[PDB]
Design an enzyme around this catalytic site. Structure first.
Site, PDB file in Angstrom:
ATOM      1  CB  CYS A  12       7.860  -2.520   9.716  1.00 50.76           C
ATOM      2  SG  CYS A  12       6.255  -1.699   9.821  1.00 50.76           S
ATOM      3  CG  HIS A  27       5.732  -0.455   2.974  1.00 48.79           C
ATOM      4  ND1 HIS A  27       4.860  -0.067   3.968  1.00 48.79           N
ATOM      5  CD2 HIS A  27       5.111  -0.181   1.802  1.00 48.79           C
ATOM      6  CE1 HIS A  27       3.758   0.416   3.422  1.00 48.79           C
ATOM      7  NE2 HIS A  27       3.884   0.358   2.108  1.00 48.79           N
ATOM      8  N   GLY A  28       9.203  -2.012   5.346  1.00 48.01           N
ATOM      9  CA  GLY A  28      10.375  -2.822   5.607  1.00 48.01           C
ATOM     10  C   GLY A  28      10.135  -3.952   6.582  1.00 48.01           C
ATOM     11  CB  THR A  43      -0.920   0.043   1.240  1.00 47.95           C
ATOM     12  OG1 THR A  43      -0.117   0.080   2.425  1.00 47.95           O
ATOM     13  CG2 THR A  43      -1.814  -1.185   1.284  1.00 47.95           C
ATOM     14  CB  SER A  44       0.215   4.689  -1.235  1.00 49.71           C
ATOM     15  OG  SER A  44      -1.066   4.911  -0.677  1.00 49.71           O
TER      16      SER A  44
END
Lengths: 146, 103, 103, 146
Positions: A135, A93-94, A34-35
């Site tokens: 994350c 993100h991660g 997701t954005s």
């Protein structure tokens, strides 16, 4: 001269150094990610903050895993001789040890290795800072009342 | 005293030395971001740098960021699973000297 | 300004806050120990605490430990694979305040 | 009173706190792990160093994985109300996120969880320090000439 201690990094080179900001907001549909709404606010805040610290800020938006590696490799091959330090901010993100490009993951180790003391000699002995907003897993902190 | 692993003629440093990782959250944890104001970590980092970059050593600045995020932020979610959660940034230093942005 | 994730009526802190991990080596790396003088890390940590515990904030002390280990130690081994290697300690801080052993 | 800043931990409680030292030198043959020569020098150096910092040092030698967990759980259930902080030193073989007992591994997370802000209330808001002398993997640093 008098007693010299060397307890702090030499930060008076001609240039403070580069501040590379990788801002990933939109990801390829194929990844199902997701954005990241609000990341542009972070990117802008960082640009202004480090500008005031006299860093040479370079921003990049929505980079694929390939572009992230290419960008980092290219930057590590620049001559940082007149720069006091290096700063890289990753917004994406991660997962633990991983940062996501728009089309897949990138091992943080792969990115930082380009700047090892033996692989980027113009940065040897100089502070290399990596600021990571991502994350590192799926655990949640319930907190405790104070 | 004398030994096999000290005082080398040719001085070397670890290839991993002089790196500092300023993580937004603890190992294994989610990292929170406000869809309007930005991530709790970056918001706080910028605020502390703006206020202390010309007054404190970097680790002390990051410690201030740790406290700001830990005390001032708590998640809000319609999903009970993700509601009322906290976050504590994680400073990982392999630096060998103090770092001041000013001189 | 106002938001859904700030200024909670009931103050809470992360359950993971106020922890500090002083690792002898970088993530994924071996940690060296002299069979006679002890580990490079503990040796250095004790020396720096002895010399600076009543003069410096803990993170600065640990930074001194990082530099001592990184510059003064190099392995010696009859096995080329483990010979002439270096080490850089790793400070992992989730503390929210400065820490002085004295007051 | 005058302006109060609260930038440093309150370290003037009646007691500085405990300094638990787990010194694992000899491991069970069944594990195939070798002895850690020189660790006793570390253990003694730590005892003297923290004694001088006014900590209540408690040393333990060659603890099994079960004893490590039992020891940590017991210590976390003590009343630390009059203590300024907590210190735990782990001396042993290890891998990333793991510390070895004399008969097997122990997740560091298991050990530290006993001291979470919500599980050890008498230490909430107080510095909890874990000093770890152990491997975190099998990588070697070739270093670079300065």
């Amino acid at each position: 001269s008098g007693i010299s201690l060397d307890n702090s990094y030499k930060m008076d080179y001609p240039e403070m150094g580069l501040c590379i900001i990788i801002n990933n907001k939109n990801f390829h549909k194929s990844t199902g990610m997701t954005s990241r709404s609000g990341t542009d606010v972070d990117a802008a805040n960082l640009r202004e903050t480090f500008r005031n610290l006299k860093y040479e800020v370079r921003n990049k938006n929505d980079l694929t895993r390939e572009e992230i590696v290419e960008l980092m490799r290219d930057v590590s091959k620049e001559d940082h001789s007149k720069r006091s330090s290096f700063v890289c901010v990753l917004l994406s993100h991660g997962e633990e040890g991983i940062i996501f490009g728009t089309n897949g993951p990138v091992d943080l180790k792969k990115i930082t290795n380009f700047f090892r003391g033996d692989r980027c000699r113009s940065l040897t002995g100089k502070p290399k800072l990596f600021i990571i907003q991502a994350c590192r897993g799926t655990e949640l902190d319930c907190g405790i009342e104070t | 005293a004398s030994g096999v692993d000290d005082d080398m003629a040719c001085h070397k440093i670890p290839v991993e030395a002089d790196f500092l990782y300023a993580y937004s959250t603890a190992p294994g944890y989610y990292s929170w971001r406000n869809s309007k104001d930005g991530s709790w970590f970056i918001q706080s980092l910028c605020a502390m740098l703006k206020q202390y970059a010309d007054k404190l050593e970097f680790m002390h600045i990051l410690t201030r960021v740790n406290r700001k995020v830990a005390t001032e932020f708590e998640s809000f979610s319609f999903d009970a699973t993700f509601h009322a959660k906290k976050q504590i940034p994680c400073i990982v230093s392999m630096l060998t000297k103090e770092l001041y942005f000013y001189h």
